[PDB]
């Protein structure tokens, strides 16, 4: 292992800063000072830090306190070298956001959440963030008739397009990344998966600067294939940022260390981010951000162990994934399974639909029974990945 700033490992203030209050109990750890967070992360090898507005500046803070806090915070960044690649807004903790921010049924709350966002774009630009994340955690319902489902999406579009037009208007070098979550805190959250988020962006006026921020655990909460889902985001050129963590099953959002959830899936996630596609295509070159929570059973030595562990796991997996693809038995196994064959277009250069239809060899005279004999050898190919992952090869 041994991470270095070149690796682009970024951590949120709320991750290591998470004190342990869950639904059935109080905090088990003392508050973490943000200046202490910066110094500790930088010592460990992180490249940058992210935060929610209220992670740094209390909801209550007076103008004088905002500036006091920011001066110390900017000093620490200076002292250490950490960048601030992403900034986000808390539109979920305060009681006012109980029915959402942007899709709150109350119009005065929608205006209040949108202004909170607009002000936060100003700080984002001031900090040098390239990405502004939006996780609509309270946008949804417990009951199906609580909302006019079409109006909720119109109100979501108004907020996102107002914010986007504001970025464009000010010429900030910022992009919006939406973050999908199927449920929790709401019984049903709007734009629950990568797909729903991607689809929604296509209905926006300012869609060009809006992309996604998928999170491992979140897609796994709907039982989906995370690599499949980031693949589709990348393919659409909408994978703007990423949150890496662990989740074991469909249950509450666990936010374990990356690699402490579905290990085999984490491996293929790393192969996609590091290696990209077998036949070539797009690559994700942004930060490797960890949106996790250090288990409440553990003290501060567990907090810094867990931060370390996120980075180690990614570097261990990276290593095994480079070895796996480089392996000539793997490349031959890949060749056999038709991995490169899928890259070939289906139609010959210039062939029309009409041409393929009436090509006797592709249909009328095709031997479907003989084509069905093909041994795709997907099991053997899977077996080679696991052995590479197990450090066995």
């Amino acid at each position: 292992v041994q991470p270095t700033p070149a690796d682009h490992f970024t951590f949120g203030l709320w991750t290591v800063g998470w004190t342990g209050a869950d639904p059935f109990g109080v905090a088990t750890r003392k508050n973490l000072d943000p200046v202490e967070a910066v110094h500790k992360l930088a010592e460990l090898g992180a490249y940058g830090i992210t935060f929610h507005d209220n992670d740094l500046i209390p909801f209550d803070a007076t103008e004088a306190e905002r500036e006091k806090i920011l001066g110390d915070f900017n000093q620490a960044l200076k002292d250490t070298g950490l960048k601030v690649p992403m900034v986000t807004t808390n539109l979920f903790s305060h009681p006012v956001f109980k029915d959402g921010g942007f899709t709150s049924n109350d119009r005065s709350i929608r205006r209040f959440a949108l202004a909170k966002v607009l002000h936060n774009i100003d700080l984002a630009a001031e900090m040098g963030a390239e990405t502004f994340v939006m996780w609509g955690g309270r946008e949804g319902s417990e009951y199906d008739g609580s909302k006019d489902l079409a109006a909720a999406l119109d109100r979501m579009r108004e907020g996102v397009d107002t914010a986007a037009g504001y970025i464009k208007d000010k010429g900030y070098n910022l992009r919006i990344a939406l973050e999908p979550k199927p449920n929790e805190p709401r019984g049903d959250i709007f734009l629950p998966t990568v797909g729903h988020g991607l689809a929604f962006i296509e209905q926006l006026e300012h869609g060009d600067i809006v992309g996604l921020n998928p999170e491992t655990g979140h897609e796994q909460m709907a039982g989906l294939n995370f690599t499949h889902g980031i693949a589709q985001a990348l393919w659409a050129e909408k994978l703007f940022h990423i949150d890496l963590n662990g989740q074991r099953g469909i249950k509450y959002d666990q936010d374990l260390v990356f690699g402490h959830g579905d290990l085999t899936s984490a491996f293929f996630t790393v192969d996609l981010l590091e290696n990209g596609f077998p036949n070539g295509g797009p690559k994700y070159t942004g930060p490797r951000h960890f949106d996790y929570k250090p288990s409440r059973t553990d003290g501060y030595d567990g907090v810094w162990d867990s931060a370390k562990a996120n980075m180690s796991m990614y570097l261990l997996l990276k290593e095994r994934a480079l070895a796996f693809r480089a392996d000539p038995e793997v490349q031959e196994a890949m060749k056999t399974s038709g991995v490169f064959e899928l890259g070939e277009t289906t139609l010959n250069a210039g062939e029309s639909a009409a041409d393929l239809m009436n090509d006797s060899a592709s249909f009328a005279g095709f031997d479907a029974e003989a084509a069905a004999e093909r041994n795709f050898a997907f099991i053997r190919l899977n077996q080679l990945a696991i052995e590479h992952l197990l450090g066995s090869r």
Copy 2:
């Protein structure tokens, strides 16, 4: 109850025709003749019938048999009055489609599946279908490295855009509807949810004639809110057809009768299709198609009971949903919860992002603590829907 053709209840041939072979056992019912299917459905009050190419014409059938089968089939339609609103292709039963049709790793199979589709568009147009459904049941994997995820989506786009360009080329009055499914038969199926399907359509060259065919049970297999998901399809103006059935939980695709799964959700599904949105907007006016399977424990009297039951459930639920929205206590409950308030734009006519930011009343001088006191009364509003559903009001 009592359905009539005006209700637009359509059934697939494979639904009532399902003989009971599941993964752990053989068929428990005798094959259903298609001409018997047409006569029986029409007697029950159905409006139309749908089918997969191989539901009617065996894979093997010679040209002479195709025409014999179609003549009898067209005669029965004539005899009875049933329309054929949707046609689809089987790209999953034959051993040749073991790695998919359109995204098969084998290029010769991709060509064979696309030609099978092209020929089937011709029959679709011949039959008077307005919708051509595409359920990519074998498009996916069990193992993450079996596929080049970007190439799979390029091969999916090539098939769908070739088929679409073919419709446009021939001037058929047909639209393509993709049908999402999270898993089964594959461990992970591409375009697993409504969202993923919607997003994918936006990357197509011929996206204008491509929409979705969501299925109750399928979105429920990822634990999603079906009404939420069809809401988003409708909002995007992509809800081209629908498959209604029942599913109890995240497990195998059960395909129970509509209403025999998640009842409360079926109720709100019916409220959305019949009533549309509380503040007005889009409406789904296509057929009410039932993609279900009559439980294998039951004989043919259970088959016709189940067909009846699909229609009854929808009409019972429709009744309760009309009463619920018409109810003045419900409309006042709705008013109280802010259902109509969400329809109001957030920004005043002409207000800019800049204007809202610096409006002291929306941010600086906003009383967030007072706005948080609002009783949204969502529980009471839910309670009124259940009582209407229970026939209690």
Copy 3:
């Protein structure tokens, strides 16, 4: 439907008293005075109230304070007539319980937890409770190597047998009810389902006074059929208490109002509680307790509405379920499907194994293809039940 004390609707103090703090935000409602909870519930028709030691008496409460609180609460009970059928212990909120109470890895903590339970048995006895509930919320792990799993069960056994032994010694008219939950707050909780709870009880020294307290939503968090789970518990005579609420799928513990989750399942649980088993058998006679949480979106008017909705839902389901079994059409359908034939022993009186295998009629010349022809008509029985549920019959 108007509840009367005779209905036996019990409510925990923590239910209507739930303030709204969740993992992503703060309390939305002010604390509830216990005196007031008692009075309000008494006006609604509640029969009794239940509580956790710390819901009533603060963790750090001095003795003078404990006496006052108890004085106020016993005054309230005397004034209103509310009974206190169950008392439980909080072994999950204080940070000392972060790895469990009874199965904490730290021995001093295990000792404290058992002491804390023993004292609470005295209190339970002085309050007149018949049931003592144990919900081991912190008993489990996030990670598989955290626990010696055989040793966690010995530790669990030690604690519960010590508590049972003490009950017996003291002559208290108290039974212990264990309550399963699959996950949350821990990634995996010990004794996660009704099956695991019943199984563990059989390894206990004092299992005769140890039974279960299943909760609707907890069984649905593993995707099990709650009606089937309480039927096993009844069948083993181990259904000592029940916790009624609603859950809308496999996700975080929702604790919605009873019937605000899976509706048909709610209906069939009510049918089991009220009508018992179709061929007779044990019947559940304890409190009909609601362990739910008033959505945080709702103000105090919502709290009493939701309290009321629980009893309304239950009474509405009871009315329907009584009509359902009383229907001649329903009884006929039941007959046809073999619901009453299941109740007949398989063997004949004094028919042994050998007698049966040698009986020619039963095996050697049994016509399996003719037997397989039976139309069980389970679909039609199900349709009849739903029609009773919707009150269209």
Copy 4:
């Protein structure tokens, strides 16, 4: 890693013999001659083979045919040396079993099923099997009113006690292993988890020779922790057999190769099977049986590869898990986290309940805030385990 007969790898005939028929398509592979299965498995290092009555002997097999088949298969066994450790009955494939075998609603069917089992006990005994497995696949319902649930358990009990009684009477050296599955093929299956299986066994007349046969993927279909489930079964001394495979989430029964599902869980199951409990306790000593299905995409080369992958995966996990516990660093971490302190009884020798509640140190003056400071360091213990798993240590 090369398996030897000493490893005790057993395979069902239906596993490598699985032809590829699923719910959406036909068989992709030709039938496997049983003689050949035996020989191939013997060359790979299998120790034994298992089967279902009908995998070997057709349902309609005449007596002359049954004798031949048995002759061929016993020849094969004699030639290769393969043992037959478990035999099971098919009570799910024929349409007669559509509502179950033992808990079918039709009494004549229940009789046939019990007869069919009794005969198969004779066969099992003649083959030299130590275990008799019962997987009640058709025992359950799709709908809640289909069964008298107390009566379904009496019927289940009757059947299993009759089979156990008969074993005892005949003097066979056979134990019965019940195998839970939550759903599929039925919507809900009776005795769905290890907990339910263990619980039911305690209500049996002859429960002493009745234990469990848990399957990896089945527990993961309810989202439970398989390692925790087999630990309860071990702890109760009821782990008679095990079925190893992989499952990638809550969905249809995948039956992938062992380790091709949840990897860390596989690792921790292997650690439990090989290393036992950290503080000692019972140990599992039966066959390491694989109940998997070779993906249908793969030809016969894939079948033997996958067979082989199962034993490779298991041996690789064993190597790692032995290294893991042998590591001093790992043992130190274990010490720190209290893995060995869990094993110490909570009470002191001859310390009663009263002694403890009155012990001041344990409760009255226990410093709960100081105890809560303990850093359990479960995260770091977990990181060490994963690092052993990936062989980076």
